[PDB]
Design a protein around this nucleic acid. Sequence first.
DNA 1: TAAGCAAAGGGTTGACGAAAGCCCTTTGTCCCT
DNA 2: AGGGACAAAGGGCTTTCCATTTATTTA
Lengths: 302, 302, 173, 246
Amino acid sequence: TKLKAPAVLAYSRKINPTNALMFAVNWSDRDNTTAVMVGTKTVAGTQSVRGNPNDADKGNIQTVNFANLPHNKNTLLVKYNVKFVGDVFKAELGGGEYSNTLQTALENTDFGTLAYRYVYNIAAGRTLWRNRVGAESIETVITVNDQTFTFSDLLVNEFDEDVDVAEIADMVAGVLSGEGFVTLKVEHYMLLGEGSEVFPSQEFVENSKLSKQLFDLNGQAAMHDQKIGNAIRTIDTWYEDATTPIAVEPYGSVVRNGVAYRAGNKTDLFTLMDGAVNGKSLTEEDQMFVTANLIRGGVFGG
Amino acid sequence: TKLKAPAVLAYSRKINPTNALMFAVNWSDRDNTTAVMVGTKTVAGTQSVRGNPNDADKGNIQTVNFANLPHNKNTLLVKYNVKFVGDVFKAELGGGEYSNTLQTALENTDFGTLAYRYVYNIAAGRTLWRNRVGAESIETVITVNDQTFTFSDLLVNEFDEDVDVAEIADMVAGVLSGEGFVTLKVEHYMLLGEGSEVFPSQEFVENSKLSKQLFDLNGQAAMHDQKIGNAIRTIDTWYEDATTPIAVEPYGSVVRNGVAYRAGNKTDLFTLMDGAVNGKSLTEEDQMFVTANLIRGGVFGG
Amino acid sequence: IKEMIEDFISKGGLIFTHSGRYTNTNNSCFIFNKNDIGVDTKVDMYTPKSAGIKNEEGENLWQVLNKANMFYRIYSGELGEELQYLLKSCCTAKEDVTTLPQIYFKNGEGYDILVPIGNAHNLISGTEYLWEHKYYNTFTQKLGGSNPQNCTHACNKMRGGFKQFNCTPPQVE
Amino acid sequence: MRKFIIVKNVKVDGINAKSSDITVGMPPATTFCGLGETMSIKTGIVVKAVSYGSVKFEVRGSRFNTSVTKFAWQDRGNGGKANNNSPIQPKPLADGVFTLCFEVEWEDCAEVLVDKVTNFINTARIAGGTIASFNKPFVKVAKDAEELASVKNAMMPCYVVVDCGVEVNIFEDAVNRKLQPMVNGYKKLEKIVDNKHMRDKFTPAYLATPTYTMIGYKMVSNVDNFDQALWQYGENTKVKTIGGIY
DNA sequence: TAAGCAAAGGGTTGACGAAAGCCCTTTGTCCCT
DNA sequence: AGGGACAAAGGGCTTTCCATTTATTTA
């Protein structure tokens, strides 16, 4: 008949990115790392809503948090650590016959191209979300277990094949397919131009004076760890009218566009599991989607 | 004989743990310590709920308590104490009779194996369950009655014999076999990475503001004491089809997984007490489990 | 009132001003102390799996007997012996000590074993007095878990739960 | 000639906060006055009075809901009912740093009292709590109020508890004055007919109901009388204060 | 010292049930041929 | 002399009955 997820089936994080930090460096010298800090400036713009055409002559004012490269340096440095953990399938919470029948039905996935797309997203620098634009050249350096690599140009929308991402893909694919962890200490260098604007992650502010407050650790501009871990997993290219590599979620849902790319057409992850536990043959490019959501996380309820 | 069990039976807990405390230190100079301050961040994600595919193109920003190491230190320090109390044969409720004919029927069991598994479970780092996962190098320091031992690497899943742990095993088995107390101050050190994420205990709460709340001592990250005592309790490899150690439960059920091993197959507690009271000779791999229940403590119905 | 009181005695039929059901749902101990009942005091109500019949507005036996000393005008006895005797046939003593705290006290030259059981008026006057009159330091609890209607009918009626005081002193800086 | 023994900065962990179904948080004065009888019976040192402060205290849980661990399945009759989580009835716990003062008469050198309370701390539990770290006890001698003020100046910093008394009843007094109630005594209701389910089988057992009182949390450097802060056994099955109502 | 301090979009879901009733089985208690 | 009936005693599973405020709110 049917096997169902346990009322409780929770899947812990198999990626642990640290919240990235934003530093200011020069281009020719990268050792004088000086914190880009969150400063609080004030804007005096316009009252311009789609509604309320009467209020179009009275200027609004709010205090926003801004972060720029200081006017002696022309490179933004983004420093983080990402821990790719193994023990992918073992259900943290939950875990009986919907964790083990998934193991006997999901041991033959493609971990290699999975790890290739994840290390490509770090290497092509899609982890910045706004600092790519207005940048002449990007240099992303990755250090794993006392070895260092440098990446100059990778067009991010099409996952090209090269030789300096592929061996890190072998390490990460070996560390998800078994036990353990692999630590990527990654530094992104962007020649944004002299004294340009950097874009940290905004925090939620619940009824505060600041209309725009950036993420802050010790007075200094920083980006959210879950924003980094969002941008590791923008690998999903197996949905209806496959196009952009969007972030992988059980409904294929980007909340900026307000449309879920895998929902309501029998393609979602949840659906793509009950057949797997029931024993149907999962194809080569959607069990990899299921495994990418295993290494994402989430709750798998009743 | 042919006598009936008491309808209620009370046992004191003879493994009394203290709640863990969390600090951030560097891997070389451990003196420069600071508490891991539990903060509250707010995360904007997708719905990602089982079923409900119609409202799967909407966000859900919720407040989550987080606890990260600061980005000047890469080491997580843990600190707590354990007390073992002798005279485990005195029933709180229950004066004796049934208790006495079980007590003199359980004088020839293996206290040393239980003692070694307890001190091996706290030595290997089972007391952590998420901060051990991803650490570059763990180490443990145990200070008991003015002597100090230090361990570097132990396999948590497999109980492997070594000479450094057997002295602590005998020194707590002496208290366990007779009467008295022994208290050990335990510290754990983990190279996790620069500004990594730690995992304190989460509270049981339906809090209206915080979704996932981490436990605090005036803001400092901390675990539950019974979270520690569950991992020291986790010894059971004597149930049928045993592969992993589970917590001592009278029905052999862990509730995170949602299954029950020892229940309903003439293996659980309330059949084995009736067997041992009525003169039936027990299996030589069952008697240390019965003992374990007692030291963990417990009331027992009818 | 007569038909659902008759349904109550045909049911399990227990009323009480003191219980240990609030400490643990496996209690089944019930005593109606007499001398402590004053005009504004409140009483909870148990029958098996919290059953009952409404009074054609969704109104069960509880708020009936609880609403402003309704019970008093049958307990003092201005409503006749016909209702009062059938009311008095329900308040029985039920003893049980299992899964309850059992502590000691130093009496005169010796110790005394005694079981702490809870009070009926305190929970309901807590829900109706810390709430309505603006005391802003309390904890809100729900007993039991996902199915709270197992204990009593008081448990069944309001699902917001009772209120305790906070016992957190200010700490040293 | 009275003697005082002091337990400073004792870390209590696992202490269940449910003093009653209506007072949660600190355990009642029955707990800390029965600690004296616990060392009077287990050890043998006669304890006549007790006082307590709080260096720190926190009940485990959030701001309006404090709550309870997932229960075990430690009951007979739940053979197939073990795969599910638990039946969960509320039992909130706490953790705190406390100071304790005991009134003892010793008639012996003070080098035995410290060890004799030290080995009792390691085996007893503070209302289900676990002692983590505690300072070394020391013996204080006071014969008047001037030398009792030397006891007053050495508990700095702590927040001691003094009696305050009830005006008419509990929740009304908790509202208009904004004070704190806690249990100070127990009233006998009914005697259990059979003693086969007791833990002693000889002493008669009576059902009890908790009687409450109002208190006050005071800075230890600002209390006029320590005997206003000490607590002891009373009558009948109650506790009271040496110094009376503050 | 004086005049003016924005808008939408969402805010999770999963476990957390004692007692009466209804059958099923087992072993105290008693029976002759 | 021992299986078979007579019946108590545990034991698994099966409903069940709910409806108030959902708090606000921190020193």
